[PDB]
Amino acid sequence: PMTLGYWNIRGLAHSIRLLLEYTDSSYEEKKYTMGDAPDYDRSQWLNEKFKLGLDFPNLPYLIDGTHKITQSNAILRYIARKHNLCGESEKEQIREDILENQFMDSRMQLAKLCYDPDFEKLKPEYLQALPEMLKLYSQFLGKQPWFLGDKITFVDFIAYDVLERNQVFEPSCLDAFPNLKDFISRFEGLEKISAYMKSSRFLPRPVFTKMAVWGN
Amino acid sequence: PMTLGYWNIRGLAHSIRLLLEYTDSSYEEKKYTMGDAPDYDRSQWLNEKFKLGLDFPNLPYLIDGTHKITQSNAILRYIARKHNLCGESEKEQIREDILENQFMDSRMQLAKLCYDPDFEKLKPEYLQALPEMLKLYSQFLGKQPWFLGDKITFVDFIAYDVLERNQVFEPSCLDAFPNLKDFISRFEGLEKISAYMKSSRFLPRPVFTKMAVWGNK
Numbered sequence A: 001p002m003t004l005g006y007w008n009i010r011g012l013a014h015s016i017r018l019l020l021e022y023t024d025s026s027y028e029e030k031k032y033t034m035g036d037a038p039d040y041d042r043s044q045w046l047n048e049k050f051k052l053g054l055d056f057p058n059l060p061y062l063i064d065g066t067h068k069i070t071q072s073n074a075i076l077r078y079i080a081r082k083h084n085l086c087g088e089s090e091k092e093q094i095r096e097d098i099l100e101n102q103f104m105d106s107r108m109q110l111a112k113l114c115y116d117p118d119f120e121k122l123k124p125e126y127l128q129a130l131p132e133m134l135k136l137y138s139q140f141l142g143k144q145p146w147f148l149g150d151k152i153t154f155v156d157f158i159a160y161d162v163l164e165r166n167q168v169f170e171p172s173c174l175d176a177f178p179n180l181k182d183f184i185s186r187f188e189g190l191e192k193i194s195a196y197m198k199s200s201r202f203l204p205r206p207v208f209t210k211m212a213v214w215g216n
Numbered sequence B: 001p002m003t004l005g006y007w008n009i010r011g012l013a014h015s016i017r018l019l020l021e022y023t024d025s026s027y028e029e030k031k032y033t034m035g036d037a038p039d040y041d042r043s044q045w046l047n048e049k050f051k052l053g054l055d056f057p058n059l060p061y062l063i064d065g066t067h068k069i070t071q072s073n074a075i076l077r078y079i080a081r082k083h084n085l086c087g088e089s090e091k092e093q094i095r096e097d098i099l100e101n102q103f104m105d106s107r108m109q110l111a112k113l114c115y116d117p118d119f120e121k122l123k124p125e126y127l128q129a130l131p132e133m134l135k136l137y138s139q140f141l142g143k144q145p146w147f148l149g150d151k152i153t154f155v156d157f158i159a160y161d162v163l164e165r166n167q168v169f170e171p172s173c174l175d176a177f178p179n180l181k182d183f184i185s186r187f188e189g190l191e192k193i194s195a196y197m198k199s200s201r202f203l204p205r206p207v208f209t210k211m212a213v214w215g216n217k
Ligand SMILES: N[C@@H](CCC(=O)N[C@@H](CS[C@]1(SCCCCCCO)CC=C([N+](=O)[O-])c2nonc21)C(=O)NCC(=O)O)C(=O)O
Pocket: A101, A105, B007, B010, B011, B012, B049, B057, B058, B059, B060, B070, B071, B072, B073, B107, B108, B111, B208, B209
């Protein structure tokens, strides 16, 4: 089987792990443990980092035969293409590309906050902006069952992760956006996803690394 | 014409303007000016931001007919598909994806440095790590003329922007990597590109916005 390498946390492997399960992929997981503070020892990853045949050694990584991939977006697009889970038409491709980068931007803004020493001082400034962030997403989904329309594709897995981790951060953040809330239930309702969240494989905790002020 | 909206700098628009030029695209530019410090008045952009019909108002943006795009990678990929400037085989697509994301990480790393008030003290750590970063790109390019092999694709335009601006940052950084500088020459030697670079539409400076410590100016 193929190998997914990540920290033993949720992080950037969440949507990947979900997609792998949705896709009925045969995979094992290489889980890396990071040291405590103050050092945050990374040595378990580091003995190994340049010895796996990765062009740009990074985490997450996926090995699949002669295919050795880093960058979370690339791993997603790789598994996605294998199972016809991408935007098919031109218009769908545009939305795919905009969403993948937007959600990445949203993901980073949350991490930026949760890793900064000034968490508490900067927290309210993020919560100010969050409704307006999600509003944009909600309008874009509209009445669609999925972000690219009638077809579920990979951006949905990125969407779920980003949306749901905001819900863990601010529990009522989606309440003002029914379509977003429905998207969570809909995605969590999918036969192979809810099977996997009912299993021992599943890992929603912790969100970030031991380095993070929030969710570590 | 298409409209490309961005700050009046290099920034995230470099690869885009170069790709528009290589592809003979008809385009017009809406350039926004940021105010001077300490406050960096953004009104020019901010009073127009939600009146352009964009799903996620942002800079850069492209208006092409009905098509309204933000996010620099989305814009690039949009122009690229029009002219068959994408990876074709699965291997090409994997490499294209890895690089687009990898280059963005490099890009942000330089940005994080140059926007930090502790620039001076932080500079040398970036310089120490730079050869390792450039080496990885050099090993990836190998004896290939472009990053996906035999033909140019949109990822070469990203590559060019990120590699070159590091040459602007440390002019000696590419010396140990002949393939990397040959890549730079080869790109700039492209007919439509040198013509563009000799024109007055060429905007190599300033690299970043007025908020930056390095390249602001
Ligand atoms: N990442 C997405 C969107 C990119 C994006 O964030 N957009 C910026 C213009 S990006 C800018 S200049 C600084 C921005 C000034 C305001 C703060 C930005 O929020 C350009 C280039 C950088 N570079 O080449 O390394 C750099 N590093 O840091 N800033 C930069 C912006 O002004 N947004 C309009 C708004 O917020 O209303 C993309 O790929 O398009």
